[PDB]
Design a protein around this ligand. Structure first.
Ligand SMILES: CO[C@H]1O[C@H](CO)[C@@H](O)[C@H](O)[C@@H]1O
Length: 132
């Protein structure tokens, strides 16, 4: 049980098992610089600011891509919406033009167990989430 690949399958792919705390760790700013199962296990570039996302209660994940203000077509944002209606976003939608949104709605009784991250030396290009 896997999600579609949100964003682009460019760069090298790293795969990570989700930690016991069930949080997704990020470095981000105008886009998503890095992702990982832990703050020390970020894959991607060396930019952005560190933040975390609780993976518990996730109903849907929404990717925002498009023409990046600082060059190229990039994955600039991932927005997590929870069963309680709350929404947390990592990355940004403020530095993109001609943007499109790929939304992935999780099936009932699906837990995120694996992370697949496509990135280069700068930014994260794409992500895929494997379930139970
Ligand atoms: C525009 O700069 C900001 O956003 C990018 C992300 O793409 C980071 O590299 C950088 O550290 C800043 O946070």
């Amino acid at each position: 049980m896997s999600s579609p690949i949100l964003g682009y399958t460019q760069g090298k792919m790293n795969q990570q098992r989700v930690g016991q705390d069930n949080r997704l760790y990020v470095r981000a700013g105008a886009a998503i610089d890095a992702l990982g199962s832990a703050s020390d296990l970020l894959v991607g570039g060396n930019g952005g600011s560190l933040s975390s996302v609780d993976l518990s209660g996730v109903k849907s994940i929404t990717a925002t891509s498009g023409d990046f203000q600082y060059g190229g077509q990039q994955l600039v944002a991932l927005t997590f919406t929870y069963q309680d209606g709350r929404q947390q976003t990592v990355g940004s939608k403020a530095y993109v033009t001609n943007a499109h949104e790929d939304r992935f709605d999780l099936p009932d009784a699906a837990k995120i167990t694996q992370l697949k991250i496509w990135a280069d030396d700068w930014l994260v290009k794409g992500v895929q989430f494997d379930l139970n």
